[PDB]
C-alpha cells in the first residue's frame, strides 16, 4: 500500500518510507530477494530504506526504466482519440508522428530519454513501401540510465 504511493512520487508510474516504526525484517538473502524481483526493506545503523527499486520483473533486460516505458506507452495510446478525428494518409503518418515525436522529444530534452532518433525510432505501420496501412505507434526508446533501446509497439488499427 505504501510503496505504491512511493511510486506516484519518484519518477513516473526506494527512498525511506514515512511512518514506519519497525519492519518485520531489517546479505545472501537480500541478493536472493533481488533477482527474485522482490522489494526489500533493510535497516542500517537505524532508519530503514528501500533496498531496491522494485518489480517482479520477467523477460526484459534486467533494468525506473519500466516507469519511463509504461508512462510513454500509456500516454501514446490515449492520443488514439485523435485518430477518430481524421482520416489516415501519408500525411497522417506525419502529424500523428509529429505529435508523438514532439512528446518524445520533450522527454529527451527534459531528460529521461536519451539518444532519441526521430528518423528511425518512430512509426510506419506498413513496411517501408509505397503501400501503407493504419498507423500503429512503434517506438524504440531508451531510458536515460541504461544502454539499451526497447521496442514497444502500440497499435491503432481496425
Amino acid at each position: 500500500a505504501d510503496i505504491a504511493g512511493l511510486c506516484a512520487r519518484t519518477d513516473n508510474v526506494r527512498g525511506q518510507i514515512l511512518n514506519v516504526i519497525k519492519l518485520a525484517i531489517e546479505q545472501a538473502q537480500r541478493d536472493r530477494l533481488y533477482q527474485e524481483a522482490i522489494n526489500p526493506v533493510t535497516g542500517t545503523g537505524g532508519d530503514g530504506y528501500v533496498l531496491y527499486g522494485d518489480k517482479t520483473a520477467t523477460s526484459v533486460p534486467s533494468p525506473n526504466v519500466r516507469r519511463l516505458f509504461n508512462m510513454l506507452k500509456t500516454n501514446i495510446g490515449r492520443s488514439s482519440k485523435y485518430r477518430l478525428f481524421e482520416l489516415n494518409n501519408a500525411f497522417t503518418r506525419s502529424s500523428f508522428r509529429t505529435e508523438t515525436a514532439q512528446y518524445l522529444q520533450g522527454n529527451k530534452a527534459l531528460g529521461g530519454i536519451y539518444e532519441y532518433r526521430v528518423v528511425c525510432d518512430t512509426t510506419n505501420n506498413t513496411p517501408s513501401v509505397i503501400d501503407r496501412n493504419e498507423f500503429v505507434a512503434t517506438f524504440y526508446i531508451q531510458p536515460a540510465r541504461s544502454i539499451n533501446y526497447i521496442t514497444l509497439n502500440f497499435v491503432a488499427t481496425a
Binding site: N89, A90, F91, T92, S94
Partner: protein, 211 residues
C-alpha cells in the same frame, strides 16, 4: 490536351477566377439588367487583334451583335522572376509573376463600375491562402500575396469608341517541377476577395475562349 497540374496554369486560373465574377448594372426601361464581364487569357496583341475582328461590321446582323462584345477583360502573364526573401518541390521555390489585367469598355460608366469592384481590395496588397492537395495526401498551404503595382489609362477613338484601363499585378507565388497529370490531378482551393473559400474551377470554366 494540356498539362492540368501546370503551376503557371494554376496561377493564370486563380487570377482569372478572382476576376471572373464581376457584373455591371445597366438600367433599362423594363428594369435593371446586370451583365457579367467575360474574361479571356491571351497575349495583349492577340486579344486586340481578335477584338478588332469581332467588333467589325461585315453584315447587318453584326450591327446589333457588335455592342454586346464590350465590356470585357483580357488577362495575361507578362513577366516573372525569382522572388528573393534539400531538393525542390514542396518545399518549393518562391517565384514572382507579373500579370496585366486589361479592362475594355464602351462607356466610362461601365469602367467605373468594374474598377470600383476591383480596386478597393488591394491595399496595396491582397492576401489569399491557397490549398493544393495531391491525390489524397494532406493539402499543401501556399501563401499567395497579390500586389496592385500600377494602373494605365488610355483610349482608341473613331468618331466613340473604346476605353482601355490596365492594372498590373504582382503575384508572389510558388513554383516547382511538373507533377505528371498521370500521377493524379491536383485539387485546389483559395480565399476570394471576401475570404470566402471557393475551390479553383478548371481553366475551361473561367476564361471564354479567344479561339
Amino acid at each position: 490536351g494540356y498539362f492540368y497540374n501546370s503551376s503557371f496554369r494554376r496561377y493564370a486560373t486563380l487570377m482569372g477566377d478572382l476576376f471572373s465574377n464581376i457584373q455591371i448594372k445597366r438600367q433599362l426601361e423594363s428594369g435593371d439588367k446586370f451583365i457579367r464581364v467575360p474574361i479571356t487569357y491571351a497575349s495583349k496583341e492577340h486579344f486586340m487583334m481578335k477584338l478588332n475582328k469581332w467588333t467589325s461590321i461585315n453584315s447587318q446582323e453584326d450591327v446589333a451583335k457588335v455592342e454586346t462584345i464590350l465590356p470585357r477583360i483580357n488577362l495575361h502573364l507578362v513577366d516573372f522572376s525569382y522572388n528573393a526573401p534539400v531538393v525542390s518541390q514542396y518545399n518549393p521555390s518562391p517565384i514572382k509573376m507579373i500579370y496585366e489585367l486589361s479592362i475594355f469598355t464602351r462607356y466610362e460608366d461601365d469602367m467605373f463600375q468594374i474598377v470600383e469592384q476591383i480596386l478597393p481590395y488591394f491595399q496595396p496588397h491582397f492576401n489569399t491562402t491557397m490549398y493544393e492537395q495531391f491525390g489524397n495526401d494532406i493539402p499543401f498551404k501556399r501563401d499567395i500575396k497579390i500586389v496592385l503595382m500600377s494602373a494605365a489609362i488610355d483610349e482608341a477613338i473613331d468618331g466613340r469608341r473604346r476605353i482601355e484601363w490596365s492594372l498590373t499585378f504582382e503575384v508572389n507565388g510558388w513554383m516547382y517541377p511538373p507533377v505528371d497529370d498521370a500521377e493524379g490531378l491536383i485539387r485546389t482551393t483559395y480565399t476570394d476577395f471576401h475570404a470566402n473559400t471557393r475551390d479553383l474551377p478548371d481553366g475551361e470554366g473561367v476564361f471564354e475562349s479567344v479561339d
